[PDB]
Symmetry: C5
Subunit: 311 residues, 5 copies
């Protein structure tokens, strides 16, 4: 239990590898996911070397307390991960192969700008702090980095899991720290949002537009106000599935714009009635006649303009 | 505490058995259930053999630290299960009988396509990793696999609990791994969904169709829009009890279709009024007269077509 | 730490007693409650006997590790209970008095058929597994079974706490198991449901029936549809306080029936208007006149019939 | 580790003191709060006495395992409190000063009758069980009982924290138990309920009363039914912030009464229309004219009568 | 394991430093956030001093049990923090450098008066209790106080993290206590509240004001009551995101005021109809004509007055 000293003054390299067994619980509001994975570590501790011939074994086993093991920690987790050591195997030249299975709740932020058509890059950061008698550095053994074929992140498609090979070394409170960037890349499954949120929301909007083929204020006011309410619901529904971003989300813009198309419609519906009461069904009907086209056209127009600004 | 070595080079076979004591908390959104069960392990460690005559006992007891026990783990769990060792009993020939009682939260995905008339196969996967001095293989002792008669999974009927006898062996990071597939088969209890969701949803739809026996736009608009709102509620209610699937669920299709039957009805209700205002109660009433049949018939028609595509 | 051997071949009897200190968190959806209680155990381990005269003490103390203690476990709990040993007292003849204070979350199912006028029998099952060198059997020391006068289960009245004196012995995976049935009997406090759910729900229904003293379709449709909506709310409110039962609950029937009385009312309201438009205020008014009596009488009739089927 | 024996046969007195550092999470539905406090214990164990002169120290330190410490426990907590021993200090005459810092979730019931103008007395009960070789009794060292000035119970005003000096001694399962009653006295902060619940609820009610200055059934029905719905919302909102009491709460009565004033109003609104249709605007208008006064006066009357029965 | 004694009678100074790694879960209702940080401690324990020349090391390592470490605790946390010791490094003069990584849930109250345009000062209080053989005092090593550049508090902007250098010393139950005030300063990200809550709420209000350009009571009542309902929703939405303050929040005032502008509008809408029925379209229309200006002007007026009182 003290770090393997340098036959010189080289920094000690620890080889890391993560193999995801489960991803689950990608919580958008909290911006967390839960992982369940193999962590693999490898470094040379010459003090542990031995003879295959004399000792008679090709490889020797140790319990974690027996030998020095590098204090590797995750940077962006809620709590210290729950780890369970699975195997420590030393080879004759003093090469250690560490293997734990852990579970942690990771805290990587998401970009909601293109929601629900967004993609994310999840981050799991490995870090290790250098000790007083030598510098420890992390490196990625690509051979030991992966994920099993089952790994299903409910509601998301998993594109890739890779590590940035080059550690970011830097100084944190006196000693030096080595940080590795594992990257889980995912894209949201947009399908459900279509029949659940987007279409219904459009339907109630279209239903509102039939007031342009009506002359009854007593009824138009009921069409336009009733649906505006239904819209409010969908609005609230959506913003309870989402963290409060300081930027504007796509679904948020669309949802907000539609408020305008309701307010303008209530205006037109009111203007039209104001005329009819003053005996002007002529002016009214010419406005009402334009609305029937102006709305769907300015809508299908502005949506195009949003999509542009967003994709 | 080191694996029983081979009188040859055979792999060491561990015999497994799971006996469910409780299933509970089948959470559809998270796609998890909680289990509370006996895990039973059995293998031969010849080093532990003894004489009944001399030693005077037909069977000897050991504490878990005393002997080597195979590191068996669950693949698809949230966290390492909580286990409590109940008994370790060694027989004269060096046969070990291990028995723990554990509880875990298992993570097996569900298929919602036929919801709420769906059936699921829950999976509990046992795995064991081979050590450096021999290969460990899992096997199923059917005699030790079952569930007690109480085991009640609230809201589900339990059909069966069996294991696939043949382990999937494969290589994971250097060493070989042996994985067993225990399978809990359940079918959802569809009853409640009938008076709680399905019928009410139909009733409000039928109530909407009485606008076809009315000439009052001021009222039809109130019938059709008011119920469309009630429908929206049921829609939201249902989609908060369900994970966001990238496929279409039965209840989801039915619920989405009904939106169309609301939008078409608002159209007809509007068309009819447009005629009456132009003085055409003739054309109107002939359309309105067809609707009274076309709707219920196209509905009862399309539902049949869905059920088909789904079952 | 090995079981007291038989001066013969009798099974070892352990005397149990549970004394509830707290019940709390009766969760209807989950069908669990949380308990906080004394567990008391007593058995004879002759090896522990001693002389009062020589040893000078009337009774001797031991720490749990010092002596063999029977592995007693709860059958229907979420996780192994949290226990804290309070006292172990051995008397001269080798009689042990064990006493722990534990807390567990128990998993006993409820019957909702008569909800909210229902009563439940909660179950806490003690179990013990026989060891290889003798059979262990549980028994109830009634003197040590009870609950303190405070024990308040929020929202429920506690009728009784008793144990079934006769253990169910049976064989589970090789060895024999002894199971005791402690029974907590409770009845739901129905009062609040009256002003919170039941009356309001009736009031909105009665408010709907004033359409029978009206000839205005434009208004009846608003009365009947608006209240049907309010009803839907109460329906949803109630079914979020309740697990999804595969049987029909009382409140559920009542709530479902009322849907019918809304659908029929919308029919009558429509029929009446259809006549009036065809110039038939005569036929209309004779129907409308009957409704004013038929409804309240068929309602008060059918409710009686439900109560019957249910109580 | 065995209790200090009596130089006679006196019971051993343990002096207790609680000093709250944090109160937080007063959960009305669960009737729990969370505490974070100093527990202080003091008793005489003569075996521990020593000489200041020879030993050279005015006071000696011990680790909890070194000496016997009385098993003090909380009666009304969810789980055994988390404790962290801060200090054990023995004085020459064998006087022990124990000090832990703990946190627990306490389970004291609340009285909602005057909600939200209610006050509560929270209870923390210390208990200790007598051992076989002498009787232990609790007492309150007032000097060591208090709370820091910060202690802020979000949404409540803290009036006082005191202990009932006289322990309740009694026999529980063979041995004698000593129980102390610490009492945290709080009064609810009623302010927010005013602009959030009470006034809005009144406003929508007043808005409903403008139907008394209207002759339009088509509109009155919309005023009265629409607001009755808004009221239902506030009702539901309030009863989800509150446990289900078997008695009647103030806010509950007020909220329930208002249902009546809606049902009567719908009646009057209907009666008035019934007359007008029979050509009787005379009778109608005389009723409608009374309502304009009868309602506000019978309301402001009945509220006074409730407040009376409740305060 | 006993405190370093004074070469005199000076108090022992412990140097503290906190370096935030994660902030997350700022829960407004509970008034808590979760922290994940380095705690750094440093003090002189001369008993530990040694010779670099003889001993051959520039610095020596110890496990936490080996040496005396000051019992530093957080004042305002839910539970004793989870700590993991990262390093203990002793320098020849007996200077100790302690370093743990901890996570706690902190309990600092927020000021909602200017919500959602508010700023907060979060507090993390370190405390240490003096022992019987000397006084311990805390101090801030500024060099060891900070936060990494990632630290993202979802929905908030982080302005600063600093410590008040001067400890508050005071007496708590016999001994002296030293308390340090670490201060995390944050300002809320108000943006989202604009399109999500504030504008929608204004739009529905404006939509209500179109009743001033209408003469139809049957319709005005529907406009004004329908939107009052939508407003109620937003009100409820907002007050479920917020603790119940005994003071008035900005959003709360605005939301409450708007109720008045609904009640007055319903009055005017009623007054206008009352006149029209008495044949007075003259008086009506002069009132209605003023409203069209009075409302928007008294609104835009009063809002200015609130903003003033609040900022
Ligand atoms: C009428 C409907 C108005 C919709 C509001 C859209 C405003 C918006 O696009 O701003 C978003 C933008 C978001 O930036 P962005 O998404 O437009 O920038 C995209 C550029 N890429 C994606 C390539 C990096 O600005 C903000 O969200 C913050 C300020 C909001 C400005 C208003
Ligand atoms: C009108 C209602 C639209 C629902 C139609 C979906 C029918 C369907 O079977 O889905 C096809 C498929 C087919 O699955 P399947 O259930 O039809 O057939 C397979 C069933 N087994 C495998 C058991 C034999 O499911 C889907 O992926 C749903 C997406 C279909 C695409 C149409 C959705 C358009 C979005 C707007 C709605
Ligand atoms: C109109 C409302 C319809 C109410 C359903 C009536 C169910 C009454 C009944 O006793 O249920 C039978 C039984 C109820 O059991 P039980 O309460 O009648 O049996 C009584 C036995 N003791 C007294 C010991 C408790 O089982 C049911 O709950 C399911 C049957 C419901 C049948 C209704 C099916 C309709 C489907 C959609 C609605
Ligand atoms: C009805 C909606 C109108 C309400 C809008 C209030 C404007 C907020 C003013 C304010 O709080 O900003 C000050 C704060 C600044 O805080 P501060 O500078 O006032 O805090 C200083 C106070 N002491 C000194 C005590 C610390 O935020 C700003 O930077 C300006 C944001 C204003 C953006 C307004 C958008 C309104 C859009 C509504 C349409
Ligand atoms: C058009 C304008 C008006 C529109 C009206 C819209 C109405 C919207 C109302 C919807 C209310 C539904 C509230 C939540 O419903 C369910 O209530 C139950 C009561 O507790 C929840 O119980 C569950 O809790 C977990 C999630 O909270 C689940 O995963 C668990 O399995 C389950 O116990 C269910 O998960 C939860 O989904
Ligand atoms: C015609 C149709 C009628 C339509 C009207 C229906 C309106 C219904 C709206 C009801 C609002 C629902 C949300 C209530 O706000 C609060 O939301 C909080 C979560 O954001 C909840 O938080 C609480 O959770 C525990 C209960 O499970 C409490 O014990 C906790 O103390 C509290 O934090 C509160 O319990 C809960 O009261
Ligand atoms: C025009 C549209 C038609 C219908 C309009 C919408 C009507 C439906 C609105 C219903 C709102 C539901 C009120 C909030 O739900 C309840 O709030 C209570 C207080 O927060 C919940 O209390 C519970 O909290 C957990 C919820 O997950 C449960 O597990 C606990 O057992 C229980 O304490 C109840 O379990 C939970 O059912
Ligand atoms: C006329 C005035 C307007 C009237 C209409 C306004 C009514 C608007 C209806 C509001 C319906 C919202 C119901 C709650 O929906 C969902 O309830 C589920 C039940 O549990 C939630 O489930 C989730 O809860 C966590 C949030 O803390 C997530 O992080 C979890 O991953 C997820 O299980 C979802 O997050 C949550 O989005
Ligand atoms: C005329 C009848 C009235 C018209 C309709 C009445 C209004 C009905 C709309 C009320 C629905 C309000 C939604 C509540 O669900 C939300 O769910 C979110 C998660 O899905 C919550 O998120 C938060 O939950 C904790 C408890 O509030 C917070 O402290 C957490 O920080 C945050 O994650 C939000 O705080 C919580 O407000
Ligand atoms: C698809 N995931 C696998 C798996 C990998 C690691 C742990 C568990 C599993 Cl079930 C399944 C068996 C072949 C190997 C493989 O990749
Ligand atoms: C129905 N479950 C049982 C049970 C099995 C295992 C553990 C507890 C239980 Cl009460 C009940 C007693 C007979 C044996 C049996 O299968
Ligand atoms: C009512 N419960 C008591 C109690 C019993 C056991 C534990 C705590 C408590 Cl206060 C209160 C004191 C008299 C004895 C009794 O039954
Ligand atoms: C107001 N609470 C104090 C406090 C008391 C105990 C623990 C922490 C803290 Cl802050 C603050 C400093 C003066 C003493 C005091 O009462
Ligand atoms: C921005 N935060 C950093 C960081 C600091 C401490 C722990 C983890 C990390 Cl990731 C990232 C790498 C440069 C140093 C730094 O401040």
């Amino acid at each position: 239990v003290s770090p393997p000293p340098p036959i010189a003054d080289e920094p000690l390299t620890v080889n890391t590898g993560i193999y995801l067994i489960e991803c689950y619980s990608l919580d958008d509001k909290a911006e967390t996911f839960k992982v369940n994975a193999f962590l693999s570590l490898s470094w040379k501790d010459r003090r542990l070397a031995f003879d295959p011939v004399r000792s008679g074994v090709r490889v020797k086993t140790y319990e974690p307390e027996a030998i020095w093991i590098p204090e590797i920690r995750f940077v962006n987790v809620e709590n210290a991960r729950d780890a369970d050591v699975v195997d420590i195997s030393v080879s004759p030249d003093g090469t250690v192969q560490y293997l734990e299975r852990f579970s942690a709740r990771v805290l990587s932020p998401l970009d909601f700008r293109r929601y629900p058509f967004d993609s994310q890059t999840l981050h799991i950061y490995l870090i290790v702090r250098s000790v007083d008698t030598r510098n420890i550095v992390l490196a990625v053994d690509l051979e030991k980095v992966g994920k099993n074929d089952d790994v299903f992140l409910t509601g998301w498609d998993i594109e890739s899991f890779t590590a940035v090979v080059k550690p970011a070394n830097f100084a944190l409170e006196d000693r030096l720290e080595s940080k590795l960037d594992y990257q889980l890349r995912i894209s949201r499954q947009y399908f459900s949002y279509i029949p659940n949120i987007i279409l219904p929301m459009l339907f109630i909007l279209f239903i509102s537009w039939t007031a342009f083929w009506s002359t009854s204020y007593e009824a138009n006011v009921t069409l336009v106000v009733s649906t505006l309410i239904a819209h409010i619901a969908f609005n609230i529904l959506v913003e309870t599935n989402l963290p409060k971003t300081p930027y504007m989300t796509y679904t948020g813009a669309i949802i907000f714009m539609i408020y305008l198309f309701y307010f303008v419609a209530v205006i037109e519906v009111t203007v039209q009635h104001y005329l009819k009461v003053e005996s002007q069904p002529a002016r009214a009907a010419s406005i009402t006649r334009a609305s029937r086209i102006a709305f769907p056209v300015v809508f299908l127009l502005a949506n195009i303009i949003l999509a542009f600004l967003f994709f």
